[PDB]
Amino acid sequence: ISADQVNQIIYNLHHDPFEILGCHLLEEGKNTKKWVVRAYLPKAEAAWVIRPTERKEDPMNSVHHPNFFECIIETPELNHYQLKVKEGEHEKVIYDPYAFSSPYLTDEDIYLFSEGNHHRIYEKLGAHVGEINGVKGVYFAVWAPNARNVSVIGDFNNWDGREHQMRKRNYTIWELFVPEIGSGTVYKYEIKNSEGHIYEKSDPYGFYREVRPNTASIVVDIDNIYQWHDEEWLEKRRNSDPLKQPVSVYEVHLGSWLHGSSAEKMPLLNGEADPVIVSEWNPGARFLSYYELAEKLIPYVKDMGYTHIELLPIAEHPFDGSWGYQVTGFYSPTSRFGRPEDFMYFVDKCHENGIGVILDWVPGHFPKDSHGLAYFDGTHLYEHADPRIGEHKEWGTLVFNYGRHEVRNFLVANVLFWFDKYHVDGIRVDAVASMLYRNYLRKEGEWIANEYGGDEHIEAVSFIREVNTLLFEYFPGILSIAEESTEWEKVSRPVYDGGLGFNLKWDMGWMHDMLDYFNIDPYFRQYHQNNVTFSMLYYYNENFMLALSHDEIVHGKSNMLGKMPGDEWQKYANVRALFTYMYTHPGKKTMFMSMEFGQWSEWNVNGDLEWHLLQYEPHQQLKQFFTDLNALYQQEPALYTHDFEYHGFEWIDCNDNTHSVVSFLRRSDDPNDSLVVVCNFTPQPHSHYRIGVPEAGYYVELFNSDAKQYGGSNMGNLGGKWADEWSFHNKPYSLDLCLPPLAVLILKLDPTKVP
Ligand SMILES: [Mg+2]
Ligand SMILES: [Mg+2]
Ligand SMILES: [Mg+2]
Ligand SMILES: [Mg+2]
């Protein structure tokens, strides 16, 4: 480029910076092409072009001015890249702001989408504010290749689409530009199918939607509604390995954590809306907005000391009682809680408070509601046409056709969309088995095998691998968490090693072993010591997340206190012993709202949590217990650096079944960070109980779940114990401990203690 051109850009004299900035073809070679990417990055000293899907990264060079950058790259296609921008000591990674010079679909957009590889398809399908022919308006586009006609109906035309008939491109996608409308426009698509039947659909790629049970889509100027402040969070995330960090998740259903009064408006970020009543049966209650949740949930979680919030599905869904697991608006956060920018504010405030956001994401099916994706254009478009692979009959839902390019593209671009536009830090996928098996919940003679004669759903496996490959390429540092309940192998292993590419898997076996164990009267746990220890036998085959979820405190299963045997004191003590064991056992942690304060009732999705319980001491003490345990967890490296290495754990003794005692070490990089954990899972106290330890010295009683401030009896070792030179459990030294009833101790050597 010339210095004249560069200076036109620097000084805002250039007539159209997209001529020069962005990605431009320079020349074609025999088997490759030469491109240049240019960027004007005021205040950046350095920049790079990352090609994350090729695992490449190229520096940019200043050209004529220190903040004008160019990068020449030879490759056959340069469709997928990011800019890394360094401004002083800080780096950010962004999409190129000059990537798309028009709002309409290009030939290249259509080709990429037809092949299933358009990772940013949501920039062109849906509804986008823009300019065509010199006039501002909204561009709409929708994939409906077998429709006879499609028209845009909405507020702007009184729901009569005759003068807003779309134009079909390349026999596949319909488009229309509508001048002089903008964000907040309410619309649907009116489709006529091959039989002539006329019906109405919400936008598959819509970014916002009316409040259930109304279904119109709403235009969002998605890139001009919110200013983020989380660059330092995002940089730290990119440059860190979450597997080696504390990860303590507070699982939340946003619709049922806390309700407000329906007698007032729902406040939003700088505005308000009509209240959303929770149900006709509870009409004085309304949902809280994403704004109000930022103001209340976030400081609550920060005070409790969790590292992450995991949300049950927030994509738009028509029925509260699905809990979010039956989605019809994949590209929009539910309007129950306000607007897209209110959820952006929620995530930005989590990041400001050093809290990550994990979304439950639901790619496995969709319901049959007429407004949604079903039979979209008069053919089985999103779902497979064969009900033996295209329906989950026991659920009454439809299964995406994962092998169809445009359908795979809808879902793969959708997971990226939440990381891109909403900055989230992870996803969790429920019921991964539903996707992986062609015979899932199907009777003999009602499914067919794969091309090789097996029961593996090959197209679904390919799709899941693609999702996790892309996600970690574009957004290193995230969490991709699976619940898979059939022992499919290598769930949380890299795709190149034959894995599915998640980085964490819920340890459902552990959860069942634990909850079944603690439900047993303590005298009988001696016949079930194996429930305590078994899950370590397979532990290192996956990277496990120890999750006690919403699914375990519904449908007659009781909330945690109610699962426990004994009198009230003992029920609380069992909860504290179980959770202290959970937080000291190798693996990351997840627990669901209400578990942290001892709600007695099961979770009810139609009301809010029983907050009034926190007026009373026993509930206050249990919440203080979790607050302290989460603080300890973040403070003690041996509880998180080596979860997934042999080094990080070793049993001391797990043979004392008649007293339901087990003990173990956790370790980290520094030997002085090793912890001794001792568990007593009966109410019998032990005044003298010897435990083998590896070093001489004074072992401080770092945590004791029977402390009085947690509601316990305050039994224990009064600060700690000096080790005896008395060989025990095959170790050269040993502690003669007092074990409190229904309790866990954590001890730690203090090598500086004065004898
Ligand atoms: Mg009409
Ligand atoms: Mg399940
Ligand atoms: Mg058993
Ligand atoms: Mg209530």
Textual characterization of the structure:
With 755 residues, the protein is an alpha+beta fold. It has 4 domains: 1-99, no CATH class; 100-220, Sandwich (Immunoglobulin-like), CATH 2.60.40; 221-642, Alpha-Beta Barrel (TIM Barrel); 643-751, Golgi alpha-mannosidase II (Immunoglobulin-like), CATH 2.60.40. The strands form 11 sheets. Strands 17-22-25-28-29-30-31-32 form an 8-stranded parallel barrel. The chain has a 6-stranded antiparallel beta sheet with strand order 33-34-35-40-37-38. The longest helix has 19 residues, at 617-635. The chain is globular. The chain starts with a helix and ends in a 5-residue tail after the last strand. It binds magnesium ion (MG) (4 copies). One magnesium ion binds next to loops. Mg(2+) binds at residue 608.
Outline the secondary-structure elements:
Blueprint: H1 3-10, E1 22-28, E2 33-40, E3 46-51, E4 56-59, E5 61-63, E6 65-75, E7 82-87, E8 90-94, H2 107-114, E9 126-132, E10 135-143, E11 149-154, E12 167-169, E13 173-179, E14 186-192, E15 198-201, E16 217-218, H3 231-238, E17 248-252, E18 259-261, E19 266-268, E20 271-273, E21 285-287, H4 290-304, E22 308-311, E23 315-316, E24 329-333, H5 340-352, E25 356-360, H6 387-390, E26 391-392, E27 397-398, H7 405-422, E28 426-429, H8 433-436, H9 458-474, E29 479-482, E30 504-506, H10 508-519, H11 530-533, E31 544-548, H12 560-563, H13 568-584, E32 588-592, H14 617-635, E33 649-653, E34 661-666, E35 675-680, E36 686-693, E37 698-704, E38 720-722, E39 733-739, E40 743-750
Parallel strand pairs: 17-22, 17-32, 22-25, 25-28, 28-29, 29-30, 30-31, 31-32
Antiparallel strand pairs: 1-2, 2-6, 3-4, 3-7, 5-6, 7-8, 9-10, 10-13, 11-14, 12-13, 14-15, 14-16, 18-21, 19-20, 23-24, 26-27, 33-34, 34-35, 35-40, 36-39, 37-38, 37-40
The structure holds magnesium ion (MG) (4 copies).
The site of one magnesium ion (MG) has 2 residues, from loops.
